[PDB]
Each structure stands twice: as structure tokens, then as C-alpha cells.
Swiss-Prot record:
Paired cysteines (S-S): C7-C96
Catalytic residues identified in the record: E54, H85
Catalytic activity: [RNA] containing guanosine + H2O = an [RNA fragment]-3'-guanosine-3'-phosphate + a 5'-hydroxy-ribonucleotide-3'-[RNA fragment]
GO cellular component: extracellular region
Enzyme class: lyase
Keyword Nucleus found: no
Cellular localization per UniProt: Secreted
Lineage: Bacteria, Bacillati, Actinomycetota, Actinomycetes, Kitasatosporales
Principal location class: secreted
Protein name in UniProt: Guanyl-specific ribonuclease Sa
Effect of substituting N39 to A/D/S: Decreases protein stability
Source species, domain of life: Bacteria
Pfam families assigned: Ribonuclease
Length: 96
């Protein structure tokens, strides 16, 4: 299930960075940025394989990708933020 919609400005600033890189088709900081997200656990709505992709939202100080991501859907501004390593997601509203 998607846990509601969140304004971009209420997310960590790194989420804004990640969306800016998605908008320019990268390049990206991690090799895993832009791989297909399978939605294996069906947390997000069911869509075709390849409908979703994932991108790192950098955690300051982390040596690894940490727990924060944006998952894109192929729909117009369909983007989800997770801060808890894909457990929960909120739809990102870039308008606020």
C-alpha cells in the first residue's frame, strides 16, 4: 500500500537532487541507479516489469546506498520515496 503523498520540500534535500538527476537522465552516483524495480513484494500498485525503476537518495555520511530511494513509475510524475529501505513508500508531490 502507498502511505499517502508527501511534498518534495518535506523530504530530505537529497531527494530533490535525485529527481534532478532523473530529469537529466543522469549520470548518477551509484551503478544501481536506474535499474528496474521489480516491486517484488507488491507494495506499489501492480504494473508491468520495467514500469518501475529505482534511484538512490544519498544519505549524508553513508558508505553505502543506505535506506533512502526514489522509485519512478513510467506515469507522469509518478515517483515514490522510501526512507526505510523499501518497506514503506509515499508518492512525491513535486509541486510543493
Amino acid at each position: 500500500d502507498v502511505s499517502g503523498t508527501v511534498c518534495l520540500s518535506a523530504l530530505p534535500p537529497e531527494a530533490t537532487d535525485t529527481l534532478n538527476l532523473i530529469a537529466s537522465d543522469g549520470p548518477f552516483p551509484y551503478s544501481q541507479d536506474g535499474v528496474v524495480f521489480q516491486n517484488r513484494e507488491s507494495v506499489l500498485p501492480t504494473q508491468s516489469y520495467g514500469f518501475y525503476h529505482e534511484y538512490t537518495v544519498i544519505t549524508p555520511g553513508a558508505r553505502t546506498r543506505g535506506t533512502r530511494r526514489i522509485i519512478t513509475g513510467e506515469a507522469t510524475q509518478e515517483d515514490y520515496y522510501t526512507g526505510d529501505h523499501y518497506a514503506t513508500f509515499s508518492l512525491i508531490d513535486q509541486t510543493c
